[PDB]
Write a protein that binds this DNA or RNA. Structure first.
Ligand SMILES: [Zn+2]
Ligand SMILES: [Zn+2]
Lengths: 56, 96, 100, 55, 68
RNA sequence: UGGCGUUCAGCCACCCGAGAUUGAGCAAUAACAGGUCUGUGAUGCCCUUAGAUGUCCGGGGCUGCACGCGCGCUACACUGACUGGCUCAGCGUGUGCCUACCCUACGCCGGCAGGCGCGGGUAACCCGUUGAACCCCAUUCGUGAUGGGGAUCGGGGAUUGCAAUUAUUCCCCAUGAACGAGGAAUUCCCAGUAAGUGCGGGUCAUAAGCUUGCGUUGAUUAAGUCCCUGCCCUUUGUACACA
RNA sequence: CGGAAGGGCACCACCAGGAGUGGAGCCUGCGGCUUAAUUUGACUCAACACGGGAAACCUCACCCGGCCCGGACACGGACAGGAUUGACAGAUUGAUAGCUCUUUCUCGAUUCCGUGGGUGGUGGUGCAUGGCCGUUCUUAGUUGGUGGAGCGAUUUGUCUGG
């Protein structure tokens, strides 16, 4: 589900995939994206929205 | 669909305190799964969101059986115009 | 003092590298350590259909799935063991620390 | 009202209780290991779960 | 679409202009006269007035019937 | 190592050696007017659009029956029918996400069905060290549509879900037919193979005559070919032509 | 494509044998019969204990009788002096679904009435299709670069023999 939602959502902003290394108390996910400028929007606003999506 | 006024104001306050909001698509479900403190149905929240989605104030993202909303700049003005709030304060998604 | 660290993994060589690194780190930090107790693996066979409609010849899938289990027995205080487990983690091997 | 006839038939058993979480169809449901997923989407996203056809 | 059997009617609420004026009865002095019975329930007290029927009294939302 | 073969590619017999062929997956080019809108919030077009081809409740139907076939199960017995004694497996499975739904161990109540509280397990621990079926040994029967067969039918007793009759399912008694080794025609396979005979998983409020794996015992024939039914190339007249 | 033949392949071919169907009974499915409905689909290899579709109420795609809007949004009328919505006795109905009737209290701008438009649909079209599956076929066949033949489709390479 975490792959499919970001594949459906980030498809217009140059999405390739995600990489995850599990650590205690820190879920460190790396969106390996082509266009790094398009995925942030405005100082990482869409990233802070996606953190709230994962949190909710 | 008829909606309670205080619950409508609570839903718009929950939308203003964080513009992004999730929902689970389920017909046979009495109350909302996330917002479980205030006893409100999920169908009223879905209709109140698609009423803004149809006239163009929110962006929709669709999962397998889940709905996701993304607040737009017109919704930024609409929420503060409905809640009569000063324009200086911003939601949490505008904060670093 | 009796510590039973269980290591669970799907991959074989990464789990072997992690447990060998833990054994070689225990030899450098000079503590009593047992060998790798190799518990048997588990298998999960799934047989499904290929065609969405019920026409043609009857197909049968063969989906396999494996999982392993290792354990390292230790006789050491927990302050030494936490310093070992904090270093060199990977998302392949899952660690379960039990002190009894 | 209609809400009395809405919650009248119980949904405490079988396919009335559980269904697919992708297509919402009452066909090809696996109750084993808590999947509740149809076989077509299972064959589609079978590699992303971890299953693979080796033998 | 048009069926053979005619449809069953819905209870359209007949609007009454100045229906609140029939509640109180005014006097020449500064007082009031309440004809309808006050509801003694906990959900609604002196605010909601019960219906003035011929044989028993009944309140709106709490569904509480008082017969003589 | 010994024989056949241009003595090349290679092939066969033999000694020694756990084996002188374990099985499966991936599977080139090209195509079907093959299926799937009844898996899909994959989708084009038309229709419906409120008295709705949308949504919800109580039933019925999906099972139904002069007839013909498809996939399966068990008998037609003496190699067998009944009662005890004796002796073995590996796949598995299992304490919850809304959600109630899990494996059962042990002492009792009762002919069975079923019921009462009770301890262990997030699993090489608990069920479990899986006393499974066939098997072998010791009693009863003897050619009788038979003690084989339970097709057919009646009465009572229990569990499951809110709710079972046209029988959800289980238990006890009674009823004892067709069937005397099978016509034309036809399906599968060639060593732990067919076959006899069981046990787990899925379907599961109730759930195996379905399907797949896991076990035990264990044969006859064969080391050749296109005569028969198909598929694949060839030489060539070309009544075979977005073929 | 051969009614002309050869070669090697397969127990969805034979040979020598082994086990089954059809012989008896039963569970189940299809076509017809048929009903208010018996939901629809597929016909030699390549459908018929199938769609994982083993259906007492969901499953239902079908009918019998009754209710809900779950008709977004925009434009003009209604309207807070209440636009709208829920109702117990009791009649009808299947339910104590006010769905209706005898009668009025109640929630309050969410709603109601017409015009445009939108979505909803296991409703139809696989002779429009994506994706996926079966067949040839798990057969040993197939494709490029440089040369030799011409005016070119064509064929040598891509194979006379084992
Ligand atoms: Zn699917
Ligand atoms: Zn009152």
């Amino acid at each position: 589900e975490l792959n499919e939602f970001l594949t459906r959502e980030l498809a217009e902003d140059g999405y390739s995939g995600v990489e995850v290394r599990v650590t205690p108390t820190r879920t460190e996910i790396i969106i390996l994206a082509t266009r790094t400028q398009n995925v942030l929007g405005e100082k990482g606003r869409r990233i802070r929205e996606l953190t709230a999506v994962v949190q909710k | 669909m008829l909606m309670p006024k205080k619950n409508r104001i609570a839903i718009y306050e929950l939308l203003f305190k964080e513009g992004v909001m999730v929902a689970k698509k389920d017909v046979h479900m009495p109350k909302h799964p996330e917002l479980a403190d205030k006893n409100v149905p999920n169908l009223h929240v879905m209709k109140a969101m698609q009423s803004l989605k149809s006239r163009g104030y929110v962006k929709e993202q669709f999962a397998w059986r889940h709905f996701y909303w993304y607040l737009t700049n017109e919704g930024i003005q609409y929420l503060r115009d409905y809640l009569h709030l000063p324009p200086e304060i911003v939601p949490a998604t505008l904060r670093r | 003092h009796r510590i039973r660290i269980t290591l669970t993994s799907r991959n074989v060589k990464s789990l072997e590298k992690v447990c060998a690194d833990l054994i070689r780190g225990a030899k450098e930090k000079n503590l009593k350590v047992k060998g790798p107790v190799r518990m048997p693996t588990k298998t999960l066979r799934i047989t499904t259909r290929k065609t969405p409609c019920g026409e043609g010849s009857k197909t049968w899938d063969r989906f396999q799935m494996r999982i392993h289990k290792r354990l390292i027995d230790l006789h050491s205080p927990s302050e030494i063991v936490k310093q070992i487990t904090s270093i060199s983690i990977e998302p392949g091997v899952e660690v379960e620390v039990t002190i009894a | 009202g209609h809400q009395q006839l809405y919650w009248s038939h119980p949904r405490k058993f079988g396919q009335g209780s559980r269904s697919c979480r992708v297509c919402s169809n009452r066909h090809g449901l696996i109750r084993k290991y808590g999947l509740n997923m149809c076989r077509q989407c299972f064959r589609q996203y079978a590699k992303d779960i971890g299953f693979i056809k080796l033998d | 679409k048009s069926y053979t059997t005619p449809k069953k009617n819905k209870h359209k609420r007949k609007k009454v202009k100045l229906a609140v004026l029939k509640y109180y009865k005014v006097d020449e002095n500064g007082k009031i006269s309440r004809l309808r019975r006050e509801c003694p329930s906990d959900e609604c007290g002196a605010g909601v007035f019960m219906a003035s029927h011929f044989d028993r009294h009944y309140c709106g939302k709490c569904c509480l019937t008082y017969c003589f």
